[PDB]
């Protein structure tokens, strides 16, 4: 059981798991109501207009300058019922992910992936980092600084621009130095993409209407995999990129895909990163874990907490799976590192979650989204934790009929057809 309490958005605050919070990095936001669905995991059922000060409104760009795959609705997630349904939909997706051993292992790694205490200028002192905390306002009026790993927030202007972000440090690259940082995922359980069953069809931009709908549990697990990489500080640099040469339409558009996205999907897409680049990253982050173990061994003082230094050293020994000898010194065992590295990079992939959920999904990241649908996974007659849209002992159980947007047409209301905005590819048939 991943979510022990059933949260309702209108429930009063308590300063523990329901409270108004401020994020230290921004600080200019007015407090927002947040819910703690699990250890180190919070949910903010509001449109993200506060994390990025340069993205403080939901105004869409002019129609011509809009990304072909995008959707705008400034009224979405503005009422208390939408926020309450958003909250129940996100928790239901967490339980569906948790109902698989793959998702249970991913969520376990996310929980114990506490961002490192390395913000002190003194090399022998452990100090928390402002990036990895939030201020929890109490009924007393007092505020308590609480460190956390993951926050689920509603989308910004582009409703379907799901992404996993984090606040950057002034000096360090928290996402690429082993330290890790608190991850903020823009996500919505009320919308899902439309793809096609055939590979030649789904990877062609000119044809396709969105016959099958993506299970939002797979879409959430995708960004959770990004959060898992970034919580352990092993995310691949976004400028490390694979220029696509397998899709002709990708080629002529000059499209390129980051190694982080290819790794996150896994499957056959992860093979575009050659073994030489994979060894480069693995050896690189192995030395980053070595530096963390060295810093822990040199630690003699701790500041900002009533917790013992031995506890904080053991906490990051648990996160990075360090080994300790009779003297108490920490060391990084490379085989245990390869186990943790393979779990975060090869085991937790979108393709594997498709295999565990037994649902239909895009077979590659190098495709073209066909449409976007409005969904409601909260009612049990629409969507279940074990079966998703493919309700057992019904007609939706076979042949992914639950994800079929024509068979199970009452569960999907098409809002925008992306194929029509990819019709400029017709001009290479001359």
């Amino acid at each position: 059981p991943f979510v022990n309490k059933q949260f309702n958005y209108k429930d009063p605050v308590n300063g523990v798991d329901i409270a108004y919070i401020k994020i230290p990095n921004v600080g200019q936001m007015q407090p927002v109501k947040a819910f703690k669905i699990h250890n180190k995991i919070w949910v903010i059922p509001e449109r993200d207009t506060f994390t990025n000060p340069e993205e403080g409104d939901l105004n869409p760009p002019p129609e011509a300058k809009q990304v072909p795959v995008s959707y705008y609705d400034s009224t979405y997630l503005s009422t208390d019922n939408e926020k309450d349904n958003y909250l129940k939909g996100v928790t239901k997706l967490f339980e569906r992910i948790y109902s698989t051993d793959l998702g249970r292992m991913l969520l376990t790694s996310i929980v114990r992936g506490i961002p490192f205490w390395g913000g002190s200028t003194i090399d022998t002192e452990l100090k928390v980092i402002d990036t990895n905390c939030i201020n929890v306002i109490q009924p007393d009026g007092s505020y308590r600084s609480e460190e956390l790993n993951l926050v689920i927030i509603g989308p910004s202007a582009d409703i379907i621009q799901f992404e996993c972000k984090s606040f950057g440090h002034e000096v360090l690259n928290l996402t690429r130095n082993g330290y890790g940082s608190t991850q903020y995922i823009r996500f919505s359980p009320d919308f899902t993409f439309g793809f096609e069953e055939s590979l030649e069809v789904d990877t062609n931009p000119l044809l396709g209407a969105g016959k099958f709908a993506t299970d939002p549990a797979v879409t959430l697990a995708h960004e959770l995999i990004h959060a898992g990489h970034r919580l352990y500080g092993i995310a691949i640099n976004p400028n490390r990129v694979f220029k696509v040469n397998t899709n002709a339409y990708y080629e002529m558009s000059g499209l390129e895909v980051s190694f982080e996205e290819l790794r996150t999907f896994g499957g056959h897409d992860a093979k575009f990163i050659d073994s030489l680049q994979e060894n480069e990253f693995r050896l690189y982050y192995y030395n980053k874990f070595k530096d963390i173990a060295s810093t822990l061994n040199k630690a003699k003082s701790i500041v900002g907490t009533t917790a013992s230094l031995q506890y904080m050293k053991n906490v990051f020994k648990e996160k990075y799976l360090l080994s300790e000898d009779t003297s108490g010194k920490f060391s990084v065992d490379k085989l245990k590192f390869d186990k943790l590295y393979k779990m975060l990079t090869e085991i937790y992939t979108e393709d594997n979650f498709v295999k565990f959920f037994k649902v239909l999904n895009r077979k590659t990241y190098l495709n073209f989204d066909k449409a976007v649908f409005k969904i409601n996974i909260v009612p049990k007659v629409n969507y279940t934790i074990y079966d998703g849209f493919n309700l057992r002992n019904t007609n939706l159980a076979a042949n992914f009929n639950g994800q079929n947007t024509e068979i199970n047409n009452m569960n999907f209301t098409k809002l925008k057809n992306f194929t029509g905005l990819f019709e400029f590819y017709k001009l290479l048939c001359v």
């Epitope: 059981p1 022990n4 059933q6 928790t91 239901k92 339980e95 049990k380 079966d387 309700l391 057992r392």
Partner: nanobody, 123 residues
Framework: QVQLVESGGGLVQPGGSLRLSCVVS????????MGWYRQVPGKPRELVAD???????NYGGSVKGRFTISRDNAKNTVYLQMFGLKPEDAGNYVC??????????????????WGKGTLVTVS
């Protein structure tokens, strides 16, 4: 394992009445949140009326205060009384046995039990 058999379906004229009943096997009938859903092919099951473990009755939108749900724990039976039937009410009526599993209900998972359904027809 646990089976639900529904009874009392048949033909009725506009404005008539019908009484649907469903007996549930097992030793956990008092645990169940019993209910009645209208099962239509191609559409999701819609809640007609359900009743909780202590007897609180909740009804759907189409009932418009014309239906009544009751439960007899001593007989492991639930009843759906229907008054003033319109042609919009026709279809297969399936009984459901749900229960609370902590933060979520059993149907949300969903491992709750569903009957095969009794058919109600109007002319």
């Amino acid at each position: 394992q646990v089976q639900l058999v529904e009874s009392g379906g048949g033909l009725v004229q506009p404005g008539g009445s019908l009484r649907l009943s469903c007996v549930v096997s097992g030793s956990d009938f008092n645990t169940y949140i019993m209910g009645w859903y209208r099962q239509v092919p191609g559409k999701p099951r819609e809640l007609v009326a359900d009743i909780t473990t202590e007897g609180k009755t909740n009804y759907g939108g189409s009932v418009k205060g014309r239906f009544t749900i009751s439960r007899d724990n001593a007989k492991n039976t639930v009843y759906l009384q229907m008054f003033g039937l319109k042609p919009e009410d026709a279809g297969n009526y399936v009984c459901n046995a749900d229960w609370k599993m902590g933060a979520w209900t059993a149907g949300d998972y969903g491992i709750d039990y569903w009957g095969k359904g009794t058919l109600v027809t109007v002319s």
